[PDB]
Amino acid sequence: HHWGYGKHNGPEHWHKDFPIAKGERQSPVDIDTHTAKYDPSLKPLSVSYDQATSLRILNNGHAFNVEFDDSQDKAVLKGGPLDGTYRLIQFHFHWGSLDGQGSEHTVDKKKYAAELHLVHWNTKYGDFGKAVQQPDGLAVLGIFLKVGSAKPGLQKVVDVLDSIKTKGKSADFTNFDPRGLLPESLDYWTYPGSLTTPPLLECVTWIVLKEPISVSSEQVLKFRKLNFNGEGEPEELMVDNWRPAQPLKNRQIKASFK
Numbered sequence: 001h002h003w004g005y006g007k008h009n010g011p012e013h014w015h016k017d018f019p020i021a022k023g024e025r026q027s028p029v030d031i032d033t034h035t036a037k038y039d040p041s042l043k044p045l046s047v048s049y050d051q052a053t054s055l056r057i058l059n060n061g062h063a064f065n066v067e068f069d070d071s072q073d074k075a076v077l078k079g080g081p082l083d084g085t086y087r088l089i090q091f092h093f094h095w096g097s098l099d100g101q102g103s104e105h106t107v108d109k110k111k112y113a114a115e116l117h118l119v120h121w122n123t124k125y126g127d128f129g130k131a132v133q134q135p136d137g138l139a140v141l142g143i144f145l146k147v148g149s150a151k152p153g154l155q156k157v158v159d160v161l162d163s164i165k166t167k168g169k170s171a172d173f174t175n176f177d178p179r180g181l182l183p184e185s186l187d188y189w190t191y192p193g194s195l196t197t198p199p200l201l202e203c204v205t206w207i208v209l210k211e212p213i214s215v216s217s218e219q220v221l222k223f224r225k226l227n228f229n230g231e232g233e234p235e236e237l238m239v240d241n242w243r244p245a246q247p248l249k250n251r252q253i254k255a256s257f258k
């Protein structure tokens with residue numbers, strides 16, 4: 001019926017319902033590290049998550065979303081390429097069926113096992129639905145995951161997944177601190193792009209950290225036990241929920257580091 005990640009409804013089909021799929025600023029993209037240019041005009045990046053208030057985790061049939069109370073100026077992203085203040089609304093991941101794929105952005109064509117997206121909206125537009133209608137409406141902080149050592153700050157997420165196995169299920173998810181998902185370094189690449197799922201709106205300033213976080217094989221295996229289907233339907237494992245790299249077109253990727 002609707003869009004997803006399969007042969008018959010996956011990324012290569014999305015353009016029929018969402019023609020912007022073939023637009024001028026689509027995401028993700030390949031980050032060619034040799035062509036990205038250091039930009040001295042970039043101000044320092046500010047990730048201020050100390051007062052973040054998580055609420056709930058939801059399996060939406062595409063990924064799982066950890067949702068935050070964004071009714072107050074709490075968890076915010078500022079600086080870097082951004083003008084003004086962007087408020088955290090949710091995070092989610094994209095991942096693969098195997099450790100050699102899963103990320104949406106690639107780095108010199110390298111695919112990581114997964115990619116975390118911390119989604120923020122520009123407070124100048126008042127709320128998320130108005131923000132996605134603007135070219136500078138969203139800022140998505142993207143963080144690569146590689147398989148190696150466990151990420152202790154991820155385990156609370158992993159352990160709730162059994163309770164939201166299928167599409168439409170949610171669970172209370174309070175007091176989760178997203179600071180535990182960040183790598184040491186805030187070095188990043190940035191470029192103007194889009195949502196990577198329908199409606200594919202061209203409203204995102206992408207900020208993709210250079211340093212991946214490490215998660216354990218067991219952690220990512222638990223992601224792959226989720227289901228795309230609803231309860232009581234035949235099992236379709238939630239794997240390979242990533243859009244591949246799209247044409248860069250008339251864009252430059254800027255680096256925050258020399």
Ligand SMILES: COc1cc2c(cc1OC)[C@@H](C)N(S(N)(=O)=O)CC2
Nearest residue numbers: 001002003008009010013014016017
């Ligand atoms: C049977 O019903 C289907 C409905 C749709 C699709 C596939 C289906 O079966 C394969 C995909 C191709 N489009 S979309 N949004 O362009 O990916 C959504 C509508």
Ligand SMILES: COc1cc2c(cc1OC)[C@H](C)N(S(N)(=O)=O)CC2
Nearest residue numbers: 065089090117119140194195196197
């Ligand atoms: C349905 O809930 C959401 C899903 C998605 C996003 C935000 C959501 O709630 C705010 C953002 C925009 N991503 S992405 N991959 O960072 O571009 C697409 C998927």
Ligand SMILES: [Zn+2]
Nearest residue numbers: 092094117196
């Ligand atoms: Zn995403």
